Amino acid sequence: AAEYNMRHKNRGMALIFNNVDCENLTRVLKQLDFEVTVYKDCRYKDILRTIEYSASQNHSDSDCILVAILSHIWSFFTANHCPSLAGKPKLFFIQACSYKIPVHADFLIAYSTVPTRGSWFMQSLCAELAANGKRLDILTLLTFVCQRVAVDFESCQIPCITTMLTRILRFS
Amino acid sequence: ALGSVTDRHAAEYNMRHKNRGMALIFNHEHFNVDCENLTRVLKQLDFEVTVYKDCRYKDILRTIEYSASQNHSDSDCILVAILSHGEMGYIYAKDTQYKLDNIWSFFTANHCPSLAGKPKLFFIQACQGDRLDGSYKIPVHADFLIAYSTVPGFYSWRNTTRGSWFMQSLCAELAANGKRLDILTLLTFVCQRVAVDFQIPCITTMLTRILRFS
After folding, report:
1. Can you state the percent helix, strand and coil of chain B, rounding each to 5?
2. Do A116 and A162 meet the contact criterion of CB atoms below 8 Å apart?
3. Active site annotated at which positions (chain B)?
4. Residue B89 · residue B127 · CB < 8 Å
5. Total number of domains constituting chain A
6. For the stretch A65-104, what's the b/e string if a residue is b when 16 or more beta carbons lie within 10 angstroms of its beta carbon?
């Protein structure tokens, strides 16, 4: 099968863990007909804990899941552990302030590093999603997200993207 | 639909230069079919393939340093390919790690201005004891792509464990859609195939543009 089955009942869950970056993401994912819930107060341990329980959940009717973490633990989503998401996309957008990764299939991890409209990674990632999110596959979408941050910087930190997606992700 | 996406420059890597670019395939041997397939496919794709068989990792790094130093003005791109062998491990001297650690600086747009805005591809075959983090630290530079898989560095099983699935599939894809298809939907299907054959390929891009060997 070429394409991720992205015509389920529901699109899926968007947990945005933390001001204006959190908002746009929100706007845009909502326009991607995600259900978006926003977690303030940061701390490490809540995020983890929350993610535990979000993995605990019957996702049989969701195209994917999206977990954002915006600054200014995986084993929970593996197919064995989260079989309701197995060969479904599981998207990870981190904006950190050095990290390891492997393993598993259908994972994706967009990762920038921050130092009035906010960070460049988020400005571009939303400028893209919210213009071509439904037109382009995620991996060229995000590629151009790389090009626009590279490139709109200077007038007078690039996203690092790492994908195990076993198919073409289209927001249909 | 990319007809009409650009970005404050352009959509698709300029892949119509005079030459495609170098392929440097380094066999990490200790004390081959993969390494020949690779070779072939990269020749079908128009690369100038040289195949090194060395054993002191430092050799592999330096050989890389000196090719960074070349003028790839007439190059589409470059490809470096490190292949480590199944089920025995290796030893490395005190200054290798560091040396690995550096070797990306050599290729930045600053350090290597004949490849500024050109794809610098890397394929790593590594051991299931090495690390990958962003042991192989993901550089974080524009235009890099590192396709990365782990080879098992110990023993058992009978049907003598084959040529890597990463390489069987990568050659298979490249070798079929290499020219039909853009790199990331290639390396997406290379992932599919080694997963729908049950250590799955871990691709990490900073490509600023759509790469297609046209």
Report:
1. 30, 25, 45
2. no
3. 85, 127
4. yes
5. 1
6. bbbbbbeeebeebbeeebeebbbbbbbbbbbeeeeebbeb
Among A111, A132, A167, beta carbon nearest to B192: A167
**CATH code of residue A25:** 3.40.50.1460
Assess B2–A contact: CB distance below 8 Å, yes or no: yes
- Is B141 touching A (CB cutoff 8 A)? yes
Phi, psi (5° rounding) for residue A27?
A: -35, -55
| Gyration radius from chain A CA atoms | 15
Data resolution in angstroms: 2.7
Contact, A77 vs A90, CB < 8 A? yes
Angle at the Cα of B175 (from B109 to B103), degrees rounded to 5? 25
- Answer yes or no: A104 catalytic: no
CB contact under 8 A, A162 and B192: no
Grouping H, G, I as helix, E, B as strand and the rest as coil, residue A24 is helix
Residues in a beta bridge with B149: B125
Identify whether the C-beta of residue B104 lies closer than 8 Å to the C-beta of residue B146: no
Separation of alpha carbons B107 and B128, rounded Å:
27
- Chain B positions touching A99 (Cβ under 8 A) are 133-134
Q: What one-letter code names the amino acid at A134?
A: K
Domain extent for A154:
1-172
Q: Give phi and psi for B188, each to the nearest 5.
A: -80, -40
B177 touches chain A (CB under 8 A): no
From A22, A64, A72, A82, active-site residue: A72
CA distance A89 to A95: 20
Distance CA A93, CA A15 (A): 10
Inter-chain contact B200–A104, Cβ cutoff 8 Å?
yes
